[PDB]
Amino acid sequence: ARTKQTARKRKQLRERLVYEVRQKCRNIEDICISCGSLNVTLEHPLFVGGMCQNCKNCFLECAYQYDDDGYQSYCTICCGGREVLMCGNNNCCRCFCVECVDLLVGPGAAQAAIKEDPWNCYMCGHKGTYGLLRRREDWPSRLQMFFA
Ligand SMILES: [Zn+2]
Numbered sequence: 001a002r003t004k005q006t007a008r009k010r011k012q013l014r015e016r017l018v019y020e021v022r023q024k025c026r027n028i029e030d031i032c033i034s035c036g037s038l039n040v041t042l043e044h045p046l047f048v049g050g051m052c053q054n055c056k057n058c059f060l061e062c063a064y065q066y067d068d069d070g071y072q073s074y075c076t077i078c079c080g081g082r083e084v085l086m087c088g089n090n091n092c093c094r095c096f097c098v099e100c101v102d103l104l105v106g107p108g109a110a111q112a113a114i115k116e117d118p119w120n121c122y123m124c125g126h127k128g129t130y131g132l133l134r135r136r137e138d139w140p141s142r143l144q145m146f147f148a
């Protein structure tokens with residue numbers, strides 16, 4: 001995977017909650033997979049998990065933020081990130097930051113993606129499930145509803 005630093009524009013909590021999900025003491029549907037808030041008011045449209053209103057608002061904005069490389073400015077999951085992996089295919093243009101990858105796919109996963117070439121992101125890959133990341137069967141209709 002190609003990487004970039006994001007254009008300049010919580011962790012403790014996300015980290016603890018992901019541990020609890022992995023340990024089967026919390027459901028991923030009951031946390032905001034983007035920031036870790038427990039004030040879940042909707043379902044994340046791409047991946048199994050919850051989303052808070054504030055994150056929904058960021059997602060709506062970030063969807064339209066692209067860099068001059070033709071790729072999305074920010075992480076698909078958390079709408080931020082410092083360093084992001086870029087999907088190897090051109091109809092995609094998505095990015096995933098190393099924090100969410102190591103956190104949700106697993107420790108080592110980012111570095112493994114960085115050294116996989118060509119690399120297809122978690123939205124493009126045929127398997128659909130990577131660690132805690134579980135792509136929705138119906139993300140296109142969810143995504144459409146989400147933006148309408
Ligand atoms: Zn959130």
Ligand SMILES: [Zn+2]
Pocket residue numbers: 075076077078079080081096097098099100101
């Ligand atoms: Zn992220």
Ligand SMILES: [Zn+2]
Pocket residue numbers: 087088089092093094120121122123124125
């Ligand atoms: Zn992709």
